């Protein structure tokens, strides 16, 4: 490669730094998929008025904003610049991260729920969010992310993990909540797959499942196949 082979043989020992480094990142990420980073984000903005219509803003390249509130809370609707909105996506953490909005001295927590774009014109129409308050239930989306395990024996060879759900909807009642979920599927098998109640049993005290959204705890996420050769030998014979 970038150095001749004859010199690389002298420096073949050097490449431990290559492999010793990749230990560090990929292990760090693999265990940090779950945790929200502890870093405050802020979004200066302005109130709504009946004067500022859409198309007026959209030559000025501002954007509307919409928030849906929760039990007993009123809705709030705001104005902001487009480039704020895309920068809020451009984090890793966008699916769940808590973003604030400073109008004046006030701050309003939120989450990302979604955005609409005018498809034929392809400019930003609005940026929709969901309120978060500490002492009350709050909808969030906990994605599932499965680690690899070379410790089970069926997972290693000729079998295939099947992630039927990407995430879980829940209700959180406290400040810091987990970004995602991480699973070590060693004890799983063809005989038992994972089911949502196996997760419900293992969560913090501030979290609960939103039964209004899911179907049943007996529903299952991670499924494991049988062996391939045991099919393939039977396929030919």
């Amino acid at each position: 490669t970038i150095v001749g082979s004859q010199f690389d043989a002298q420096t073949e020992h050097v490449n431990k730094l290559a492999l010793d480094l990749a230990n560090k990142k990929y292990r760090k990420m693999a265990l940090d998929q779950a945790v929200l980073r502890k870093e405050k984000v802020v979004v200066p903005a302005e109130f709504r008025t009946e004067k500022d219509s859409l198309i007026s803003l959209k030559k000025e390249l501002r954007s509307p904003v919409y928030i849906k509130g929760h039990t007993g809370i009123p809705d709030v609707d705001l104005i902001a610049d487009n480039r704020q909105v895309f920068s809020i996506r451009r984090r890793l953490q966008f699916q769940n991260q808590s973003f604030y909005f400073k109008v004046g001295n006030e701050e309003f927590r939120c989450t990302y729920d979604h955005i609409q774009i005018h498809p034929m014109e392809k400019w930003l129409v609005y940026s929709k969010y969901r309120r978060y308050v500490v002492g009350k239930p709050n909808s969030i989306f906990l994605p599932i992310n499965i680690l690899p395990t070379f410790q089970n024996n069926a997972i290693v060879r000729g079998s295939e993990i099947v992630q039927l759900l990407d995430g879980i909807w829940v209700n959180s009642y406290n400040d810091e909540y987990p970004h995602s979920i991480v699973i070590d599927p060693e004890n799983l098998s063809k005989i038992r797959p994972l089911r949502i109640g196996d997760i419900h049993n293992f969560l913090p005290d501030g979290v609960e499942i939103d039964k209004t959204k899911c179907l049943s705890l007996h529903q299952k996420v991670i499924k494991i196949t049988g062996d391939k050769e045991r099919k393939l030998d039977i396929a030919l014979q």
Partner: protein, 55 residues
């Protein structure tokens, strides 16, 4: 670390197009004989050596 410690520097460079003129005489260019201090650190044609003659 080699580039600073060299004394009798002999800058060289190629005028190769392709090895067909050499392969089709069963020849080629060696670098085991006089495994040199440097080959193509910044300029991807330069070579530096101590030997005032280098065949």
């Amino acid at each position: 670390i080699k580039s600073t410690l060299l004394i009798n520097n002999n800058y060289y460079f190629n005028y190769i197009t392709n090895g067909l003129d050499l392969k089709y005489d069963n020849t080629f260019q060696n670098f085991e004989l006089n495994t040199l201090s440097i080959k193509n650190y910044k300029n991807k044609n330069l070579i530096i050596s101590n030997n005032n003659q280098l065949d």
